[PDB]
mmCIF file of C-alpha atoms and ligand atoms in Angstrom:
data_model
loop_
_atom_site.group_PDB
_atom_site.id
_atom_site.type_symbol
_atom_site.label_atom_id
_atom_site.label_comp_id
_atom_site.label_asym_id
_atom_site.label_seq_id
_atom_site.Cartn_x
_atom_site.Cartn_y
_atom_site.Cartn_z
ATOM 1 C CA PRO A 1 219.571 239.622 152.805
ATOM 2 C CA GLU A 2 216.894 242.028 154.016
ATOM 3 C CA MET A 3 217.014 242.543 157.716
ATOM 4 C CA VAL A 4 213.945 243.895 159.904
ATOM 5 C CA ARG A 5 214.067 244.583 163.462
ATOM 6 C CA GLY A 6 218.020 244.084 163.622
ATOM 7 C CA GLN A 7 217.653 240.170 162.768
ATOM 8 C CA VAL A 8 217.817 237.982 159.420
ATOM 9 C CA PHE A 9 214.570 237.831 157.307
ATOM 10 C CA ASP A 10 215.918 236.503 154.091
ATOM 11 C CA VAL A 11 213.343 235.594 151.944
ATOM 12 C CA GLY A 12 214.500 236.806 148.653
ATOM 13 C CA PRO A 13 214.619 237.163 145.885
ATOM 14 C CA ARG A 14 211.166 236.389 145.366
ATOM 15 C CA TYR A 15 209.660 238.371 148.181
ATOM 16 C CA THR A 16 210.532 242.148 148.592
ATOM 17 C CA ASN A 17 209.812 245.245 150.339
ATOM 18 C CA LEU A 18 209.339 243.811 153.874
ATOM 19 C CA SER A 19 207.301 245.383 156.522
ATOM 20 C CA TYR A 20 207.101 244.240 160.176
ATOM 21 C CA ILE A 21 203.534 243.101 161.413
ATOM 22 C CA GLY A 22 204.394 241.580 164.776
ATOM 23 C CA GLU A 23 205.935 239.227 166.963
ATOM 24 C CA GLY A 24 203.822 235.927 167.434
ATOM 25 C CA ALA A 25 204.175 232.449 168.977
ATOM 26 C CA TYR A 26 206.964 231.321 166.645
ATOM 27 C CA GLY A 27 209.006 234.583 165.970
ATOM 28 C CA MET A 28 208.810 237.657 163.915
ATOM 29 C CA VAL A 29 206.047 238.052 161.299
ATOM 30 C CA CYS A 30 206.155 240.669 158.183
ATOM 31 C CA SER A 31 204.344 241.332 154.878
ATOM 32 C CA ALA A 32 206.278 241.522 151.714
ATOM 33 C CA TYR A 33 205.553 241.552 147.962
ATOM 34 C CA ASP A 34 205.314 238.445 146.224
ATOM 35 C CA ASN A 35 207.220 239.385 142.946
ATOM 36 C CA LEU A 36 205.915 236.073 141.178
ATOM 37 C CA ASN A 37 202.120 236.719 141.958
ATOM 38 C CA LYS A 38 202.255 240.331 142.332
ATOM 39 C CA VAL A 39 200.535 240.549 145.552
ATOM 40 C CA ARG A 40 201.588 241.035 149.140
ATOM 41 C CA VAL A 41 201.804 238.290 151.523
ATOM 42 C CA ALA A 42 202.487 237.522 155.300
ATOM 43 C CA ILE A 43 205.709 235.471 156.030
ATOM 44 C CA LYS A 44 206.539 234.371 159.535
ATOM 45 C CA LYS A 45 209.947 233.224 160.498
ATOM 46 C CA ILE A 46 210.190 229.988 162.865
ATOM 47 C CA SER A 47 213.436 229.114 164.536
ATOM 48 C CA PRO A 48 212.590 225.845 166.337
ATOM 49 C CA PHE A 49 215.408 223.603 165.847
ATOM 50 C CA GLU A 50 216.732 223.759 169.360
ATOM 51 C CA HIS A 51 213.856 222.191 170.997
ATOM 52 C CA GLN A 52 211.683 219.167 171.038
ATOM 53 C CA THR A 53 208.359 221.062 171.600
ATOM 54 C CA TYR A 54 209.359 223.859 169.169
ATOM 55 C CA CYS A 55 209.829 221.193 166.338
ATOM 56 C CA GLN A 56 207.007 219.299 167.574
ATOM 57 C CA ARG A 57 204.478 222.446 167.246
ATOM 58 C CA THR A 58 206.195 223.431 163.826
ATOM 59 C CA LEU A 59 205.665 219.951 162.317
ATOM 60 C CA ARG A 60 202.114 219.844 163.192
ATOM 61 C CA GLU A 61 201.361 223.266 161.763
ATOM 62 C CA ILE A 62 203.033 222.422 158.535
ATOM 63 C CA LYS A 63 201.738 218.906 158.280
ATOM 64 C CA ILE A 64 198.302 219.582 158.900
ATOM 65 C CA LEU A 65 197.929 222.987 156.909
ATOM 66 C CA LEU A 66 199.569 221.406 153.725
ATOM 67 C CA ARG A 67 196.974 218.734 153.767
ATOM 68 C CA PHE A 68 194.026 220.770 154.608
ATOM 69 C CA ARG A 69 192.257 222.844 151.715
ATOM 70 C CA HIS A 70 189.381 224.915 153.067
ATOM 71 C CA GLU A 71 188.109 228.541 152.472
ATOM 72 C CA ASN A 72 187.888 229.037 156.331
ATOM 73 C CA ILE A 73 191.250 227.539 156.996
ATOM 74 C CA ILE A 74 194.575 229.655 156.465
ATOM 75 C CA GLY A 75 196.800 227.959 153.574
ATOM 76 C CA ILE A 76 200.349 227.601 153.138
ATOM 77 C CA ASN A 77 201.419 229.059 149.879
ATOM 78 C CA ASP A 78 205.094 228.765 149.960
ATOM 79 C CA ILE A 79 207.916 227.355 152.280
ATOM 80 C CA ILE A 80 211.369 229.278 152.603
ATOM 81 C CA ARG A 81 214.380 227.431 153.916
ATOM 82 C CA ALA A 82 217.995 226.675 153.107
ATOM 83 C CA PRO A 83 218.659 223.663 150.550
ATOM 84 C CA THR A 84 220.187 221.376 152.949
ATOM 85 C CA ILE A 85 219.562 220.365 156.730
ATOM 86 C CA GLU A 86 222.887 221.490 157.801
ATOM 87 C CA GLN A 87 222.117 224.944 156.530
ATOM 88 C CA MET A 88 218.576 225.072 157.692
ATOM 89 C CA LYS A 89 218.369 227.189 160.939
ATOM 90 C CA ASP A 90 214.904 228.790 160.216
ATOM 91 C CA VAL A 91 211.946 228.349 158.035
ATOM 92 C CA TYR A 92 209.448 230.725 156.630
ATOM 93 C CA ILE A 93 205.978 230.017 156.263
ATOM 94 C CA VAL A 94 204.228 232.089 153.359
ATOM 95 C CA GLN A 95 200.641 232.780 153.664
ATOM 96 C CA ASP A 96 197.743 235.022 152.454
ATOM 97 C CA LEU A 97 197.925 238.736 153.657
ATOM 98 C CA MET A 98 194.909 239.323 155.803
ATOM 99 C CA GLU A 99 193.864 242.753 157.358
ATOM 100 C CA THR A 100 193.657 241.778 160.966
ATOM 101 C CA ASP A 101 192.710 238.755 163.396
ATOM 102 C CA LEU A 102 189.715 238.810 165.658
ATOM 103 C CA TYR A 103 191.862 239.792 168.906
ATOM 104 C CA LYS A 104 192.927 242.872 167.445
ATOM 105 C CA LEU A 105 189.337 243.642 165.744
ATOM 106 C CA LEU A 106 187.603 243.296 169.217
ATOM 107 C CA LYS A 107 189.954 245.627 170.903
ATOM 108 C CA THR A 108 188.470 248.374 168.889
ATOM 109 C CA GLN A 109 185.448 247.572 167.115
ATOM 110 C CA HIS A 110 182.027 246.812 167.962
ATOM 111 C CA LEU A 111 180.568 243.924 165.910
ATOM 112 C CA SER A 112 177.242 244.356 164.483
ATOM 113 C CA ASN A 113 174.813 241.328 164.661
ATOM 114 C CA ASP A 114 175.243 240.619 161.054
ATOM 115 C CA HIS A 115 179.123 240.416 161.504
ATOM 116 C CA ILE A 116 178.758 238.180 164.809
ATOM 117 C CA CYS A 117 176.766 235.746 162.500
ATOM 118 C CA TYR A 118 178.859 235.646 159.768
ATOM 119 C CA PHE A 119 181.991 235.296 161.794
ATOM 120 C CA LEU A 120 180.485 232.375 163.928
ATOM 121 C CA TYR A 121 179.404 230.580 160.655
ATOM 122 C CA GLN A 122 182.900 230.654 159.173
ATOM 123 C CA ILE A 123 184.322 229.519 162.351
ATOM 124 C CA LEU A 124 181.926 226.463 162.496
ATOM 125 C CA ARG A 125 182.272 225.895 158.828
ATOM 126 C CA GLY A 126 186.180 225.726 159.110
ATOM 127 C CA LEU A 127 185.920 223.656 162.234
ATOM 128 C CA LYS A 128 183.232 221.105 160.489
ATOM 129 C CA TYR A 129 186.286 220.571 158.088
ATOM 130 C CA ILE A 130 188.795 220.307 160.982
ATOM 131 C CA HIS A 131 186.792 217.783 162.833
ATOM 132 C CA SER A 132 185.716 215.907 159.809
ATOM 133 C CA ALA A 133 189.384 215.082 159.392
ATOM 134 C CA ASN A 134 189.435 213.746 163.174
ATOM 135 C CA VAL A 135 191.636 216.633 164.063
ATOM 136 C CA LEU A 136 191.152 219.015 167.281
ATOM 137 C CA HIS A 137 192.151 222.504 166.908
ATOM 138 C CA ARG A 138 192.704 222.620 170.896
ATOM 139 C CA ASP A 139 193.681 226.490 170.704
ATOM 140 C CA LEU A 140 190.799 228.134 169.207
ATOM 141 C CA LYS A 141 190.837 231.964 170.314
ATOM 142 C CA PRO A 142 190.228 235.235 168.806
ATOM 143 C CA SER A 143 194.101 235.812 167.801
ATOM 144 C CA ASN A 144 194.130 232.507 165.932
ATOM 145 C CA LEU A 145 191.083 233.734 163.464
ATOM 146 C CA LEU A 146 192.389 236.043 160.759
ATOM 147 C CA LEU A 147 189.949 238.193 158.794
ATOM 148 C CA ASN A 148 190.774 240.063 155.357
ATOM 149 C CA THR A 149 189.299 243.423 154.429
ATOM 150 C CA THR A 150 185.945 241.782 153.295
ATOM 151 C CA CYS A 151 185.822 240.049 156.600
ATOM 152 C CA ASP A 152 186.669 236.639 155.289
ATOM 153 C CA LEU A 153 187.576 234.619 158.216
ATOM 154 C CA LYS A 154 190.308 231.842 158.270
ATOM 155 C CA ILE A 155 191.399 229.532 161.322
ATOM 156 C CA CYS A 156 194.992 229.442 161.860
ATOM 157 C CA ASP A 157 197.695 228.107 164.075
ATOM 158 C CA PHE A 158 197.477 224.299 164.261
ATOM 159 C CA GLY A 159 200.813 223.787 166.447
ATOM 160 C CA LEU A 160 198.658 222.436 169.441
ATOM 161 C CA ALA A 161 196.239 220.284 167.216
ATOM 162 C CA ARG A 162 195.792 216.616 167.871
ATOM 163 C CA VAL A 163 194.063 213.541 166.152
ATOM 164 C CA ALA A 164 190.913 212.986 168.359
ATOM 165 C CA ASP A 165 191.405 210.062 170.940
ATOM 166 C CA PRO A 166 188.196 210.129 172.886
ATOM 167 C CA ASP A 167 188.761 206.715 174.333
ATOM 168 C CA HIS A 168 192.102 207.928 176.324
ATOM 169 C CA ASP A 169 190.498 211.320 177.100
ATOM 170 C CA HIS A 170 190.126 210.339 181.198
ATOM 171 C CA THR A 171 192.760 211.980 183.406
ATOM 172 C CA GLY A 172 192.992 213.272 187.197
ATOM 173 C CA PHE A 173 191.930 216.223 188.600
ATOM 174 C CA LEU A 174 194.005 219.609 188.287
ATOM 175 C CA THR A 175 195.929 217.991 185.240
ATOM 176 C CA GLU A 176 198.350 220.133 183.587
ATOM 177 C CA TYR A 177 197.376 221.884 180.123
ATOM 178 C CA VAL A 178 198.997 223.867 177.591
ATOM 179 C CA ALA A 179 196.152 225.379 175.487
ATOM 180 C CA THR A 180 195.020 229.323 176.384
ATOM 181 C CA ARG A 181 193.451 229.708 179.847
ATOM 182 C CA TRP A 182 190.146 231.691 178.963
ATOM 183 C CA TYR A 183 189.092 229.338 176.237
ATOM 184 C CA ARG A 184 189.508 226.188 178.392
ATOM 185 C CA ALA A 185 186.514 224.146 178.750
ATOM 186 C CA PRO A 186 185.594 223.253 182.186
ATOM 187 C CA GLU A 187 186.237 219.455 181.917
ATOM 188 C CA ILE A 188 190.025 220.220 181.159
ATOM 189 C CA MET A 189 190.499 221.270 184.931
ATOM 190 C CA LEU A 190 188.435 218.387 186.206
ATOM 191 C CA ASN A 191 188.722 215.082 184.299
ATOM 192 C CA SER A 192 189.662 215.470 180.634
ATOM 193 C CA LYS A 193 192.738 215.739 178.335
ATOM 194 C CA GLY A 194 191.317 217.690 175.865
ATOM 195 C CA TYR A 195 191.236 214.577 173.267
ATOM 196 C CA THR A 196 187.577 215.124 172.181
ATOM 197 C CA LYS A 197 185.776 217.488 169.652
ATOM 198 C CA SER A 198 183.803 218.984 172.287
ATOM 199 C CA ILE A 199 186.833 220.698 173.859
ATOM 200 C CA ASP A 200 186.788 223.197 170.426
ATOM 201 C CA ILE A 201 183.096 223.733 170.570
ATOM 202 C CA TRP A 202 183.685 225.125 174.104
ATOM 203 C CA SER A 203 186.445 227.710 172.828
ATOM 204 C CA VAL A 204 184.011 228.674 169.938
ATOM 205 C CA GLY A 205 181.384 229.397 172.356
ATOM 206 C CA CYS A 206 184.039 231.542 174.487
ATOM 207 C CA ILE A 207 184.711 233.336 171.158
ATOM 208 C CA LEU A 208 181.041 234.085 170.514
ATOM 209 C CA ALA A 209 180.371 235.332 173.923
ATOM 210 C CA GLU A 210 183.470 237.654 173.206
ATOM 211 C CA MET A 211 182.089 239.058 169.927
ATOM 212 C CA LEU A 212 178.627 239.847 171.686
ATOM 213 C CA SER A 213 180.508 242.194 174.309
ATOM 214 C CA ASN A 214 184.019 242.708 173.427
ATOM 215 C CA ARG A 215 185.158 241.463 176.660
ATOM 216 C CA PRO A 216 186.399 237.605 177.329
ATOM 217 C CA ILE A 217 183.471 235.777 179.401
ATOM 218 C CA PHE A 218 185.565 233.637 181.406
ATOM 219 C CA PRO A 219 188.870 235.717 182.074
ATOM 220 C CA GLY A 220 190.206 233.746 184.813
ATOM 221 C CA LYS A 221 193.920 234.549 186.488
ATOM 222 C CA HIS A 222 195.241 231.171 186.842
ATOM 223 C CA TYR A 223 194.471 227.311 186.573
ATOM 224 C CA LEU A 224 191.743 226.723 189.121
ATOM 225 C CA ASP A 225 190.400 230.255 188.798
ATOM 226 C CA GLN A 226 189.396 229.585 185.307
ATOM 227 C CA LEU A 227 186.881 226.994 186.737
ATOM 228 C CA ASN A 228 185.501 229.312 189.370
ATOM 229 C CA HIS A 229 184.812 232.108 186.382
ATOM 230 C CA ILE A 230 182.846 229.446 184.467
ATOM 231 C CA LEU A 231 180.799 228.026 187.509
ATOM 232 C CA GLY A 232 180.087 231.850 188.487
ATOM 233 C CA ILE A 233 178.003 232.022 185.223
ATOM 234 C CA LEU A 234 176.905 228.416 184.512
ATOM 235 C CA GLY A 235 175.962 227.963 188.216
ATOM 236 C CA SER A 236 176.477 224.676 190.046
ATOM 237 C CA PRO A 237 176.369 221.550 187.714
ATOM 238 C CA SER A 238 173.247 219.242 188.252
ATOM 239 C CA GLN A 239 173.410 216.063 190.168
ATOM 240 C CA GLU A 240 173.163 214.138 186.669
ATOM 241 C CA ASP A 241 176.227 216.028 185.306
ATOM 242 C CA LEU A 242 178.151 215.462 188.586
ATOM 243 C CA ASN A 243 177.193 211.759 188.180
ATOM 244 C CA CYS A 244 179.097 211.936 185.003
ATOM 245 C CA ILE A 245 182.354 212.760 186.586
ATOM 246 C CA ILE A 246 183.430 209.393 188.253
ATOM 247 C CA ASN A 247 186.889 210.699 189.488
ATOM 248 C CA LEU A 248 186.365 211.439 193.060
ATOM 249 C CA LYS A 249 188.818 214.372 193.630
ATOM 250 C CA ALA A 250 187.090 216.245 190.481
ATOM 251 C CA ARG A 251 183.359 215.258 192.054
ATOM 252 C CA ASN A 252 184.450 216.024 195.585
ATOM 253 C CA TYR A 253 185.781 219.726 194.756
ATOM 254 C CA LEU A 254 182.603 220.525 192.850
ATOM 255 C CA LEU A 255 180.597 219.206 195.962
ATOM 256 C CA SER A 256 182.535 221.270 198.191
ATOM 257 C CA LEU A 257 181.499 224.477 196.637
ATOM 258 C CA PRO A 258 178.330 226.632 197.885
ATOM 259 C CA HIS A 259 175.434 226.792 195.611
ATOM 260 C CA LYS A 260 175.735 229.134 192.824
ATOM 261 C CA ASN A 261 172.859 230.156 190.462
ATOM 262 C CA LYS A 262 173.084 230.372 186.606
ATOM 263 C CA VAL A 263 173.425 233.778 185.514
ATOM 264 C CA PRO A 264 170.814 234.275 182.471
ATOM 265 C CA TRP A 265 172.433 234.883 179.184
ATOM 266 C CA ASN A 266 170.112 237.668 178.446
ATOM 267 C CA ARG A 267 170.963 239.509 181.583
ATOM 268 C CA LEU A 268 174.544 239.384 180.650
ATOM 269 C CA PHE A 269 174.039 240.326 177.039
ATOM 270 C CA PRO A 270 171.072 242.337 176.887
ATOM 271 C CA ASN A 271 171.526 243.563 173.296
ATOM 272 C CA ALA A 272 172.232 240.055 171.655
ATOM 273 C CA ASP A 273 169.960 238.278 169.340
ATOM 274 C CA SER A 274 168.031 235.680 171.147
ATOM 275 C CA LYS A 275 168.687 233.064 168.537
ATOM 276 C CA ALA A 276 172.650 233.852 169.257
ATOM 277 C CA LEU A 277 172.261 233.116 173.074
ATOM 278 C CA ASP A 278 170.257 230.285 172.671
ATOM 279 C CA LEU A 279 173.276 228.680 170.417
ATOM 280 C CA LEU A 280 175.677 230.092 172.931
ATOM 281 C CA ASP A 281 173.919 228.094 175.546
ATOM 282 C CA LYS A 282 174.453 225.049 173.816
ATOM 283 C CA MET A 283 178.095 225.683 173.179
ATOM 284 C CA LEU A 284 178.753 226.430 176.571
ATOM 285 C CA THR A 285 177.057 223.573 178.242
ATOM 286 C CA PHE A 286 179.188 222.122 181.091
ATOM 287 C CA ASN A 287 178.529 218.521 180.333
ATOM 288 C CA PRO A 288 180.907 217.868 177.155
ATOM 289 C CA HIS A 289 178.501 214.915 176.038
ATOM 290 C CA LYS A 290 175.360 217.514 176.317
ATOM 291 C CA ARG A 291 177.570 220.105 174.173
ATOM 292 C CA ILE A 292 176.304 220.609 170.913
ATOM 293 C CA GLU A 293 178.348 219.484 167.897
ATOM 294 C CA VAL A 294 179.676 221.296 165.102
ATOM 295 C CA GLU A 295 177.268 220.070 162.536
ATOM 296 C CA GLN A 296 174.192 220.819 164.860
ATOM 297 C CA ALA A 297 175.757 224.345 165.642
ATOM 298 C CA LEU A 298 175.779 224.754 161.900
ATOM 299 C CA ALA A 299 172.011 223.869 161.718
ATOM 300 C CA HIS A 300 171.084 226.165 164.518
ATOM 301 C CA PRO A 301 168.168 228.735 163.764
ATOM 302 C CA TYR A 302 170.755 231.567 164.467
ATOM 303 C CA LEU A 303 172.726 230.507 161.526
ATOM 304 C CA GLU A 304 169.785 229.890 159.150
ATOM 305 C CA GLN A 305 170.680 232.688 156.377
ATOM 306 C CA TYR A 306 173.981 230.623 155.896
ATOM 307 C CA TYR A 307 173.520 227.166 156.588
ATOM 308 C CA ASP A 308 173.791 224.847 153.652
ATOM 309 C CA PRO A 309 175.528 221.552 154.265
ATOM 310 C CA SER A 310 176.243 220.837 150.634
ATOM 311 C CA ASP A 311 178.502 224.110 150.822
ATOM 312 C CA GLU A 312 179.992 222.816 154.243
ATOM 313 C CA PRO A 313 182.587 220.537 152.728
ATOM 314 C CA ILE A 314 184.517 217.861 154.722
ATOM 315 C CA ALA A 315 187.971 216.271 154.521
ATOM 316 C CA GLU A 316 188.722 213.718 151.850
ATOM 317 C CA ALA A 317 190.379 211.591 154.238
ATOM 318 C CA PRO A 318 190.884 211.363 158.514
ATOM 319 C CA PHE A 319 194.241 212.554 159.423
ATOM 320 C CA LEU A 320 211.072 211.233 168.737
ATOM 321 C CA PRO A 321 213.880 213.704 169.186
ATOM 322 C CA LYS A 322 214.613 217.105 167.639
ATOM 323 C CA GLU A 323 217.022 215.526 165.118
ATOM 324 C CA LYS A 324 214.126 213.169 163.460
ATOM 325 C CA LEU A 325 211.781 216.360 163.773
ATOM 326 C CA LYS A 326 214.264 218.492 162.015
ATOM 327 C CA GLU A 327 214.676 215.967 159.311
ATOM 328 C CA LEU A 328 210.563 215.413 159.234
ATOM 329 C CA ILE A 329 210.472 219.262 158.677
ATOM 330 C CA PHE A 330 213.053 219.316 155.945
ATOM 331 C CA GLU A 331 210.781 216.460 154.323
ATOM 332 C CA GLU A 332 207.549 218.308 154.694
ATOM 333 C CA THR A 333 208.905 221.598 153.264
ATOM 334 C CA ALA A 334 210.746 219.956 149.964
ATOM 335 C CA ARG A 335 207.870 220.708 147.887
ATOM 336 C CA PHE A 336 208.456 224.241 147.747
ATOM 337 C CA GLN A 337 212.054 223.621 146.564
ATOM 338 C CA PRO A 338 213.741 225.025 144.353
HETATM 339 N N1 DF8 B 401 200.922 234.772 162.337
HETATM 340 N N2 DF8 B 401 200.225 235.958 162.381
HETATM 341 C C1 DF8 B 401 199.799 236.485 161.493
HETATM 342 N N3 DF8 B 401 199.480 235.825 160.425
HETATM 343 C C2 DF8 B 401 199.229 237.047 159.409
HETATM 344 C C3 DF8 B 401 198.705 236.948 158.031
HETATM 345 N N4 DF8 B 401 198.394 236.069 157.302
HETATM 346 N N5 DF8 B 401 198.214 238.143 157.496
HETATM 347 C C4 DF8 B 401 198.114 239.320 158.271
HETATM 348 N N6 DF8 B 401 198.673 239.361 159.693
HETATM 349 C C5 DF8 B 401 199.007 238.294 159.861
HETATM 350 N N7 DF8 B 401 199.637 237.939 161.328
HETATM 351 C C6 DF8 B 401 199.998 238.958 162.435
HETATM 352 O O1 DF8 B 401 200.961 238.588 162.921
HETATM 353 C C7 DF8 B 401 201.096 239.117 164.253
HETATM 354 C C8 DF8 B 401 202.089 238.195 164.941
HETATM 355 O O2 DF8 B 401 201.318 236.845 165.204
HETATM 356 C C9 DF8 B 401 199.718 239.511 164.770
HETATM 357 O O3 DF8 B 401 199.432 240.848 164.980
HETATM 358 C C10 DF8 B 401 199.074 238.758 163.900
HETATM 359 O O4 DF8 B 401 197.559 239.049 163.278
#
């Protein structure tokens, strides 16, 4: 078997000429030559079977991506694993080879307003499909957005995704949460489990702000610090918005803070398109009930050059210990045998 960086990466004989790309949430990622389709591909090696939560994320990623079919969501082209459960220790997911991700791109490249507009259009177009399937991505951030050489954008990594459940979204103040801190909506720290679609719109708002300046807008250093970054820009929530927070611990925390004025978007982003900042304001709305939804965002004037609801498709239908989960992962990957 071909090896890379001292560890096994046996994808052959179909995939050859391996090249290491990097280390991701699951393990090692390489590019390789697909001898059948005569193209290079990306392959990620996943080794989850020791742990409930690892097997959880792997099953979510595989199940969702195999059911979704959308130009702005990465597909699964192939899955490589041993022929038997007994012999299966690793799973390799084969996907289209992209040129970069938005995290790497924003480290070194200034985006033109035309690129910002096109990227945001594609994020929202993909998210319209995700949300139409009743699925929440719950971890949108630049490193989960891949781009090819012609700047086609694909949403990746559904390992933290969930089916939306707005009737069970309420929780207490400072409830623990898993998704990435800088892209977390304020209500996560206050009273929300992140089971409603507005959680994803907040993340997209954060991504838009980061495309405008090449810096995260809310770079909190720890859990409650994240909220104090958000409030330092949005300012103090209104009485109406506080009245929507019935939980006393969360409400009284906000009431305990000195008054903070809103920082105007055009002061933070003096080079930005004014229509972009209008949409940014609507995505980064404190009250999740007032926050713009994905289909309204697509119809915003900023996106007028691209908006076409007939070309923004929706999903055909809405969407346990490790031993049962290994069995599920084995079952979910059977179609690629062999
Ligand atoms: N799962 N990640 C990933 N998928 C890729 C793909 N389909 N095409 C190109 N690069 C891909 N990466 C890169 O691998 C590294 C570790 O995550 C990072 O640098 C990513 O950008």
